[PDB]
């Protein structure tokens, strides 16, 4: 009731979302390992002469900036 | 069901070996946090015994390095959510005043040796304390009890948030009611 | 089958009543399915899951061989949701040693996966190399062949596998049954 009510109800509106766990932004290290294995099999496949090559290159820098935001200063 | 229970039983038996380095026990405590969250409610009242050891070691923050303290930050952050017996268990048993006690870290004690890890500690402790908020009435009264933290809350309004899902400090100040 | 400890698939929750997974875990897996598509076409390719099972298991390229043509039921090369979910269900149901309870009530799916060519009847050349999934040795292959062929023409049946799947959950009285059998 009153100023107790109208704020905190919206916070359980916050309580449904995708809600990543604290380790869901760091569990992908072996996912990077298996996709970099896909990169080295892909380098054994066709090399750099290609453009879906360029889109998976855009994917590897996209996840590079996606992991960089938690790993700028952590190193 | 019970295979998760028994495997955390023996790795908890590693957890009460005193004569070892703490870091493998810290990633073990990460495994309790993730496995207890992916179990559900029944895993949480199974794991209702196991905060004695981590509650014992969270008062020794002045001895170990920053890796150990940030590791039990996401251990309690992974454990705490959607957990009712937890969220009235912790404010009677020295947790959120201990997070306040964690927060003096470096604004009066140290200045710089390599002080980037200090704001990494603030990032992980604020992401720890947003996910313990739930919808109760008890905890923000004693959050209103302290005095200087709002000023420090102003400081976590000042610093930039790089690549986070959203800025947790401004929804924190929205939920803390000093606006 | 021994998977690698510390992997993500070792952290999942298995129930021992209907042998299934949770809604929130498959929500997490559709998030990983959404992010793992490089060309984002709501589907899945092969070599990523090949490297994924190389990380989480310890099986050589023949196992990649019959696994990757059992999962290719769609016969277009590009795979999707349901085969990924049921394959991760079965591979995390191996190590729990209660998989007999899992296909106790998953009869029609393992029919449809063992019907690799759509004639409703199953030959021995199909499952002669799928015994890594169920650790069944050749002597009890001979016993199951010469004791449970009502069809009698090295072929299978729906109600025959109903007897097979009520056979699978009660093996102690099955050893006492073969103790009685010669008498």
Numbering used by the authors:
A (entry chain C): 119 to 193
B (entry chain B): 58 to 236
C (entry chain A): 1 to 183
Authors' description from the paper:
Calcium signal transduction mediated by CatSper is essential for sperm hyperactivated motility and successful fertilization. CatSper is the most complicated ion channel known, comprising at least thirteen components.
Notably, further improvement of map quality in the region corresponding to cytosolic map 2 by local classification and refinement yielded a local map at 4.8 Å resolution, which displayed clear secondary structural features, primarily α helices. During data processing and model building, we noticed a distinct additional density near the previously characterized EFCAB9 and CATSPERζ, which may represent an extra component of CatSper. We found that the main body of the predicted structure of ARMH2, which contains three armadillo repeats, can be perfectly fitted into the density. Moreover, we also tried complex prediction of the candidate proteins with EFCAB9 and CATSPERζ using AlphaFold 333, and the interface predicted template modeling (ipTM) score of ARMH2 stands out among all other candidates, which is the only one above 0.7. The predicted ARMH2-EFCAB9-CATSPERζ ternary subcomplex is highly consistent with the cryo-EM map. The cryo-EM resolved regions of the ARMH2-EFCAB9-CATSPERζ subcomplex are primarily in areas with high predicted local distance difference test (pLDDT) scores, supporting the assertion that the unassigned density belongs to ARMH2. Notably, the residues that potentially mediate specific interactions between ARMH2 and the other two components are highly conserved across mammalian species, suggesting a conserved interaction mode of the subcomplex. Based on the structural characterization, we speculate that ARMH2 acts as a scaffold to support and reinforce the cytosolic subcomplex.
